[PDB]
Amino acid sequence: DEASVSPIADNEREAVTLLLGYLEDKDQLDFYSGGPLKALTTLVYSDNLNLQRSAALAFAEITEKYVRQVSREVLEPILILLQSQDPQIQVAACAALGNLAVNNENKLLIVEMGGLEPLINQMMGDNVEVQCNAVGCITNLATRDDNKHKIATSGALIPLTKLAKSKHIRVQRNATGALLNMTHSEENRKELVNAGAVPVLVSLLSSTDPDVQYYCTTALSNIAVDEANRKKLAQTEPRLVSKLVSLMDSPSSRVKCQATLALRNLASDTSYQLEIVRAGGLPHLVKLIQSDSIPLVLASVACIRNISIHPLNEGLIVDAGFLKPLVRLLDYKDSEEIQCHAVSTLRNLAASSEKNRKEFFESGAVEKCKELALDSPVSVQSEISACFAILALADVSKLDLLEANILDALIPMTFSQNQEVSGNAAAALANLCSRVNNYTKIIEAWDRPNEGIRGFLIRFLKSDYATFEHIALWTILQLLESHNDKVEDLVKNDDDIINGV
């Protein structure tokens, strides 16, 4: 001024001394407003590199400490620090921006103020720390649904794909994390596929890093949701199935689970329904449905439910010993989904071929089904109903089913208000009465239990469902053409014949 001179302007000395005053009483004072904010702003605008650095470190430590929603004016200076050429300023400023980007509103506010291009150009510089931090920012910003569209259509997927291959593990973690967060919507997945990041992920399923391989597994699992993606992946990278199968035995459990789910998503299509079995995933799954951890059980039984759709797999599936663990899973009462998956699996297995039927029966499947045929959710009831409908079409199995007192389960199910349950149960009952050598159990179940077959016929004759009236009539004719006197005079009751209208 007049007595002395310094290299630093007086407003900035003001700022620095005030800042010193604040940094040792963080408790008491809010930093995203007022005094602290004007200090930091002044220090951002300054000529002096050291003061800028000081501001950046300040911002970084503050944002590290606590995260709240902040105004325009908290963000502008950090965005200006981002424009700096000083490496450590870049580091601190990015870290601060990400710590702020933890909070949801701040994500939208940051992206809307145009932070994307700074972050992107930071990522294309070859200082590793700023790569890690800037990519990290993109990662945290890509967790808001509003943003990921705008992030995708900005060209960030290209440096993300690039940096996902980094020899530095921190960078790779943040990068693959971002790529993962870009797989929550269909169009983001489309954009992600276009950038050619799929071969990178597929390759990085072999990463020894837990975080990286988990992120890539989850990302691929999320991509497999779309059918076009599934086809294109079946064409492009054939090795995927194998790698996922091997990942079903990973050190980390979340990886086993997510990989199993990815295999389910893939198993939605038939080519994969076969190729998973070729890759020898049946052992891992057998081990997994018998496991303790119920998410693994859920994933594995959903997966096997999808795989069992293809008939050609059937034998393999039975020869791998799946039946009794599945029947065991039927006892699980607390998870409706596991029940549904297991019973649906059984339905698939039975519906496919009539060859390993013997093994199916020997598994104790039918008795468990009979046991749950009334005490179970309508879902399970429905699948059990379909299953019975399937089994009652094997002429050689008819008398055995009848002998196992299957009518005691079928007859009440025909009261169910669910079209599938009642319908298929009635069809099964009808086909059990058709052309059997012995009508004993049919006779014994004429009135008992639950009003018996007589009650059944009487009711379904008066249904409006044309098909039901017809299965009633057809049942009657199948009983008349039974060449068994007793039953033919059981039809002498003409409740049936004046209602046979």
Binding site: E64, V91, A92, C94, A95, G98, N99, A101, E129, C132, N133, V135, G136, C137, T139, N140, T143, R170, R173, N174, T176, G177, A178, L180, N181, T183, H184, Y215, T218, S221, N222, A224, V225, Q258, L261, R264, N265, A267, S268, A302, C303, R305, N306, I309, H341, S344, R347, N348, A351, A386, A389, I390, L393, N424, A427
Partner: peptide, 26 residues
């Protein structure tokens, strides 16, 4: 031959995993 037919969408339909990645900094 008159088996009950499985609905085209009667399978375990694919889902998007709910996991969201968190960034780690300096």
């Amino acid at each position: 031959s008159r088996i009950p037919i499985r609905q085209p969408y009667h399978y375990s339909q694919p889902t998007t995993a709910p996991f969201q990645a968190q960034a780690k900094f300096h």
